[PDB]
């Protein structure tokens, strides 16, 4: 019989297990025998306290580096306000040691854990690339709780070196199975930010993770968008409990919060899943997340059923991660076929936007060709357009099976006149649908002002396979 941990703060880790069903079902995976043994996770952040009493026994120097000062030791820089505590808190969520009389436990408490010190300095494109491409035949899973500013007016993503690091990672990393990149979807909720305006979360190569409060609500800081894949618990109001983890100066904290705490919990659950099947590819892992995540009792006003009968939301993706279900489904999972890519250039001429524009196009999805796709994964609408006030635009895309994805909601603070320059808006909401048929793009002015502009390019990019489907 499995014996649950005895650590002094484990009873306060409400999100790991309980009778209530408001948890991530992690104890069920522990009882099947999976605790993370043999898996390696790296925290890309402001450093890691490698001598912390709840981290030292799992610390792995092969998963660590200091990019800011160019040395191998990722120890954080100590200051009066404890500014560099962020990475240490994230690491303890993944892999804090169990049954040692100290603080609580990680999701994957027997996994090996490291850190890249890269936020404590100027974060250039080169700095990101060296961190994402660190030791890719040793590190399995990378976790990033940072990104572009959440002011609700920025449009920004990885530059050339960073994007090259993503493609190298998923292609040649982990022995050719592909690095696993986990991302926090953002903290811009109060600014009405959209996580599709962030190229790191919007990327097909990252698993973008949102947050739910203890009582099952959308937190104040949460950003909605179509590129989010799934959700884990984090903080909410002051009557709701928070996240328990390792803190700077060898302390324990019960008040870790925000989008920053959701991605490390997902990285831990992915570590358990990899232990149950080491042969899973980067795309396999996203299939497992789509099939096993749980919507039940997450409150939102936009829940919709897609073409294959799955519930999906722009606040939550496919819902809460389920650790016990992930490791069960992983054990006899059959590897997916190689990824195909079908490119469809939609427009024959530019179109004025005006008050409202609708573009309809029937596609065959590369019928007759080696990249024919009948089973969709990610879809992108790559748009080039000019407009006088960018944040007044709302953009929607409808798939042939009837699924409406919000590519862009209104952003009140976005006054830019710079438009979008081939920006690849991404949606996960049509996963496993047949993409043959009519697609519809809608662009509208949500304000009463007399705005003007022109849509000059619309490329629909489809990714997926032509085999292996399951009954909806």
């Amino acid at each position: 019989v499995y014996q649950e941990p005895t650590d002094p703060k484990f009873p306060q880790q409400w999100y790991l297990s309980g009778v209530t069903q408001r948890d991530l079902n992690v104890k069920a995976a522990w009882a099947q025998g999976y605790t993370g043994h043999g898996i390696v996770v790296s925290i890309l952040d402001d450093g890691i306290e490698k001598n912390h009493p709840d981290l030292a026994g799992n610390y792995d120097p092969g998963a660590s580096f200091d990019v800011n000062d160019q040395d191998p030791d990722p120890q954080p820089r100590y200051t009066q306000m404890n500014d560099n505590r962020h990475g240490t808190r994230c690491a303890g969520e993944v892999a804090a040691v169990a049954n040692n009389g100290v603080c609580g436990v990680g999701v994957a408490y027997n996994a090996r854990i490291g850190g890249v010190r890269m936020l404590d300095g100027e974060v250039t494109d080169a700095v990101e690339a060296r961190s994402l491409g660190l030791n890719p035949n040793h590190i399995h899973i990378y976790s990033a709780s940072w990104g572009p500013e959440d002011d609700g007016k920025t449009v920004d993503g990885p530059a050339r070196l960073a994007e090259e690091a993503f493609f190298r990672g998923v292609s040649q990393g982990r022995g050719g199975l592909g690095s696993i990149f986990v991302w926090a979807s953002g903290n811009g909720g109060r600014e009405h930010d959209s996580c599709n305006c962030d190229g790191y979360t919007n990327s097909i190569y990252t698993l973008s993770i949102s947050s739910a409060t203890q009582f099952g609500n959308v937190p104040w800081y949460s950003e909605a968008c179509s590129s989010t894949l799934a959700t884990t618990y984090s903080s909410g109001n002051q009557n709701e409990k928070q996240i328990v983890t390792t803190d700077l100066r060898q302390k324990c904290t019960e008040s870790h919060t925000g989008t920053s705490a959701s991605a490390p919990l997902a990285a831990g659950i992915i570590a358990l899943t990899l232990e149950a099947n080491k042969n899973l590819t980067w795309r396999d892992m996203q299939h497992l997340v789509v099939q096993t995540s749980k919507p039940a009792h997450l409150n939102a006003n936009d829940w919709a059923t897609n073409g294959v009968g799955r519930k999906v939301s722009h606040s939550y993706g496919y819902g809460l991660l389920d650790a016990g279900a992930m490791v069960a489904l992983a054990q006899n999972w059959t590897t997916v076929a190689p990824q195909r890519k079908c490119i469809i250039d939609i427009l024959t001429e530019p179109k004025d936007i005006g008050k409202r524009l609708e573009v309809r196009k029937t596609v065959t999805a590369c019928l007759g060709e080696p990249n024919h796709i009948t089973r969709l994964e990610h879809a992108q609408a790559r748009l080039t357009l000019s407009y006088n006030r960018r944040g007044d635009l709302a953009i929607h895309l409808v798939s042939p099976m009837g699924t409406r994805s919000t590519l862009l909601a209104a952003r009140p603070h976005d006054y830019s006149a710079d438009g979008f320059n081939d920006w690849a808006f991404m949606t996960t909401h049509s996963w496993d649908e047949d993409p043959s048929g009519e697609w519809v793009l809608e662009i509208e002015n949500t304000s009463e002002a007399n705005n003007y502009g022109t849509l000059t390019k619309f490329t629909l990019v489809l990714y997926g396979t032509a085999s292996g489907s399951l009954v909806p």
């Binding site: 962020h86 936020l119 974060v123 250039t124 940072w146 990104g147 572009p148 500013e149």
Partner: peptide, 6 residues
Amino acid sequence: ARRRKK
């Protein structure tokens, strides 16, 4: 003044 934020 920062390109990337925690």
